[PDB]
Design a protein around this ligand. Sequence first.
Ligand code: DGT
Ligand code: MN
Ligand code: MN
Length: 174
Amino acid sequence: MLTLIQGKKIVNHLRSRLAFEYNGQLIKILSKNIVAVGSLRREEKMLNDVDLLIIVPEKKLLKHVLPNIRIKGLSFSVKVCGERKCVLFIEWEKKTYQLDLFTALAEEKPYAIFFFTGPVSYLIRIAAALKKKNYKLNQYGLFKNQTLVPLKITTEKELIKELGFTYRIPKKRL
DNA sequence: CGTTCTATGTGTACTCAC
DNA sequence: GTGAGTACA
DNA sequence: ATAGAACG
Ligand SMILES: Nc1nc2c(ncn2[C@H]2C[C@H](O)[C@@H](COP(=O)(O)OP(=O)(O)OP(=O)(O)O)O2)c(=O)[nH]1
Ligand SMILES: [Mn+2]
Ligand SMILES: [Mn+2]
């Protein structure tokens, strides 16, 4: 059980204090690559976890980022962890809260921000409407017949447009 | 023929068996 | 190592 | 979004 007001605050603590351990060397993830997503990006009044998105700049780093995740000074358990999804139950001023971390390559930034803000039913109703047209939309790309179709694309709003859906700010998405 | 309702996707990390 | 089958998005 | 079905 978690409300937006400190959900905002928890993410503020972390914007500066996420890092991983790359073959002995700690490396800090900088906020120009931390994105809030999920119900927090959609400004839901009440949350039941925080979903952060971590953008790694080169592929060779994916294997090491999340399995070796380190947040400065706060205890947490990993329930699950791989190289593109990890889940952490963290201690917030004597409160236990669920933290889901994901990772996207730069090449995936909009596709991944889209997919990971949601809401769920939004996603089910766009991945459907695009399959009809012999496409498939997932976390990583827009694919027609197992080949990525190139889109001169950078942010979310251009992707939502260039595939043919009305763009609504996170809060008003469904 | 219009109004209303309904349904619809996809991938990751995990776990036991052969 | 593969991989069906599951928890959980 | 969109299309198929029940409804009138
Ligand atoms: N819940 C859910 N999320 C999914 C699913 N598939 C993809 N997603 C994406 C969209 C969600 O924004 C994101 C996971 O978000 P969460 O499951 O934590 O819920 P959300 O953040 O949207 O609201 P919440 O965390 O429940 O307060 O993953 C799915 O099948 N179920
Ligand atoms: Mn969430
Ligand atoms: Mn989550």
